[PDB]
Amino acid sequence: MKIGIMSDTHDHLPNIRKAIEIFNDENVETVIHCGDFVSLFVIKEFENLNANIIATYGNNDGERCKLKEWLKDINEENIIDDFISVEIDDLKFFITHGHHQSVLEMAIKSGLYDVVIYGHTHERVFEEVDDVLVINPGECCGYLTGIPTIGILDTEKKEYREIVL
Ligand SMILES: [Mn+2]
Ligand SMILES: [Mn+2]
């Protein structure tokens, strides 16, 4: 019943592994990654991730179709689009790389989802803005802010918390 959240891994292999371990060692049914993986080899490291993967395309993600195939050879369930609007554990999700703010803003203001997830900015935030649970797990790589993070969301109690690496 635990969903893993992460973003902007920017090829940092170490922190990527540290997150892939932290996730396994827990429930974590699925892992949302809205970030810029940035390079194809990042996808191999994930072959070691127990849960499945719902990813979004970061704007730096060059190999757009290679990433998709690869993510699948790793698992048929794994999905990756520019925008993913799904329902999970009886909850409406809108996931996207922080990329396009206009669409992000409207997903929140709209009132069609319960939970909204994005990244891009590298600034982790965790706020409730009109019933909407808005989450940016921050930068797994820790490059711009120097604070490397990821996060786990409780789909049951609607509870969440950051994890520093
Ligand atoms: Mn970005
Ligand atoms: Mn980025």
Which residues does 110 contact at the CB level (< 8 Å), separation at least 6?
none
Go through 27-44 and write b for each residue having 16 or more CB atoms within 10 A of its CB, e for each that does not: ebebbbbbbbbbbeebbe
Phi–psi pair at 107, nearest 5 degrees: -65, -35
Tokens of 28: 């974590």
Give every strand in the sheet of 133-136, ordered side by side. 83-88, 91-96, 115-117, 133-136, 125-128
Say what the resolution is, in angstroms. 2.5
The Å distance, Cα 122 to ligand 1 centre, comes to: 8
Structure-token pair, residue 108? 């929140």
What residues are neighbours of ligand 1 (ion), with CB under 5 Å?
Answer: 36, 58-59, 120
| CA 51–ligand 2 middle distance (angstroms) | 23
Nearest Cα residue to 58 out of 74, 41, 80, 85: 80
List the domain boundaries for the chain.
Answer: 1-165
Under DSSP, is residue 31 helix (H, G, I), strand (E, B) or coil? strand
CATH architecture, range 1-165: 4-Layer Sandwich (3.60)
For this PDB entry, the determination method is X-ray
